[PDB]
Amino acid sequence: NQAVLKFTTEIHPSCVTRQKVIGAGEFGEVYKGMLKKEVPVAIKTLKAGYTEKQRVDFLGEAGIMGQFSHHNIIRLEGVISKYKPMMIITEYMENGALDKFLREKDGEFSVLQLVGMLRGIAAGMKYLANMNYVHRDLAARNILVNSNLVCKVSDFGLSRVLEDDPEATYGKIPIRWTAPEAISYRKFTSASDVWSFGIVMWEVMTYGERPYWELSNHEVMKAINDGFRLPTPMDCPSAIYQLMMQCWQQERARRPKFADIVSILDKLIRAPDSLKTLADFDPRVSIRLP
Template identity: 35%
Template sequence: MAEEDTESRCSIPAGFSPALTKKQKLKVNIYNEVLVRLKDSDVSEARQPGFEDELWSHFNRLPTRYALDVNVERAQDVLMHKRLLHMAHDPATRPAVEVRLVQVHSSSGSNSSRKADAQCSGSAGKQSHPPPAFGLSEDLELALEAKKLQVQHGNNTVPRPIYEITISTSDKPKLLSELTSLLSDIGLNIQEAHAFSTTDGYSLDVFVVDGWECEETERLRQTLVNVILWSEKNPCLDHNVMPPVLGPDGGMKVTGDHVSTSSEGKDIWEIDSSLLTYEKKIASGSNGDLYQGTFCGQDVAIKVLSTDRLNETMKEFAQEVSILRKVRHKNVVQFIGACTKPPNLCIITEFLSGGSMYDFLRNQKGAFSLQSLLKVAVDVSRGMKYLHQNNIIHRDLKAANLLMDGNGVVKVADFGIARVQAQSGVMTAETGTYRWMAPEVIEHKPYDNKADVFSFGIVLWELLTGKLPYENLTPLQAALGVVKKGLRPPIPKHTNPMLVELMESCWQHDSSLRPEFSDIVNMLRQMTRRVADEREDRRKGKSAKVVPTLRHGSAE
């Protein structure tokens, strides 16, 4: 190959600023390396006019993380990703799904996985398979899982076959949550996942899984296409909630224990949208925007539902209205009313000037003092105790969903995915935010209100450290670590031993071992008194008291 030809292909793509950041330089270098590998191969597509621009366009529409994570030695995988994203544009070929057997080598270099490959009819007679396109997370050492997950074949032990599933479809809120749930529903165990969104509204999600029998990969691919299509055609189906529909007058009707408005009788909390004044936007999300405003002279927060995804978001909107209208507690955000007739769909609550605990921690650039932490924790646990006493599971408890008023009182907020607990006492369907999610929820197993207790334990850690849980991992890597490795956030040295005990009891893997919020309230009150006593003793120059062990259900 001529030296000048190589140089012409290894340059900054047209239209890209020469003033590159470190990550942008890496992205360009990876693009060039993939380009060279493809042109040096026998891939006919790489010899077509305009291919260089098409390849750069592919890299540029995906986040920089895609380029940094992809295995450049498997340059043809990039073409596969490019092809799937192209197919996702056409409703006739969407979702685009690719399934292949992959080879996962453990750190010991064992070749035992080849024995399994040879026995799979999907291997087409080959003795080995390519590695995954993005590898496996070193942080969690998930590559070792492939060696541990084994089945018996006579007297020989061989690993289960490992598959890489790549899915491209229209991007939407909570798509990754839906896909992981669907994979679990058909019996697949996710060992690793990489999720990317393009700049033009499409997704590229790559899963490394096991749990599928040794069959043709085409059968697994077709199964996935079928279940994804079914899910897209039935977006409102849920084991515990009936889908909302619009009544003949345009008002919202939800069957069962949920919102119902009709022309025959208007609920007292229905608000005339003309009485609302919007002052400034506070936040934006995939389902709508949050504004500060006024209603009849009162400062309020107005959560406006986006009409772009009305069919997808109506269920959560109805559910939040249903729950908020029933609750009234000092430590739960106060519901004022709602507009439930399109196009003015919004929820109006009290305005809490202190903002969220998440923002408070970031603004003060540090964690709470122990005394302040205990005050916040008592407020949150009181609110959660009330919700659980009324059979309401929050399902998304985290610092970002805890708001503070002007007097420093903290309240539980954001009931978009909260649910009324089923009569059986357990629920299914994964929901919430991965970094705070209980292991039984991550694994799509039945769960109850103890899932909120697990999340509360993570919230305590947030308040203690001022950091994002598992900040060096992606959300899905963190979730896999929680389930498979017993991963929990590291508790700093010199943390109050009573607080350590409470956090560890809250995030027990076995939900039955976690305390109830009624117990947590009592434990926090004990802790508050003891911390205050110790401070007073130090002030008076006395020696600190011996700290007794906290017990669930101790008297106040």
């Protein structure tokens, strides 16, 4: 990390005030705070006693983020490494994680706003892919949302990404977001990230429904292998359901690249009447009245 850390600003602790816990784990917490006017920031700590591996993983996330400069990728402000506890300081996303946000805002956005969120996520992912960065854990829980409704990809690093995520279960993998080839033989590429993006599309258009509902991890893998796919969300544009289905091709070579996804979403947004044509929604319940 010593090479890539030279791109990051070392911040003095007297410039940082922590104010409110917004995330927490065994080895540190994430705070909303202020950075000296003064600007809101998010602050992640690593408490004393950390191991060499933990230090390398922790500062490695900042080192990776410091290499990126894109509207849809969380921005690094700097690090505190010369004092303890060490800290990583980023821009503050006021609306938190996208999955929880949508579940708390059920039905409150237009179809155009939801597709705009997907375009922003896809733009971030195209940037990452072309920068030769494979995310491996793309999911609504790892997208953050600000007060302009801008969605930004977060959660960077090497082994810490899948190790730290409770949704990743023993390889340790978040099964129902992961492409078949990454599950079967550990092949993680930007194309398996495209599979995950298709799941994210479904999460957004359903306002945070849990993919595959109560199917077990094994049931999900069996269903996918036998050709089943997630059904159309309610009120979902046909073009958007078609696009998420193409992300879920078993044959990795047949999936769109993020370049294609960005292009398609941009065209649909720029001609928004195209989003008024809806895919048929198969009701799970029949209600009949004389």
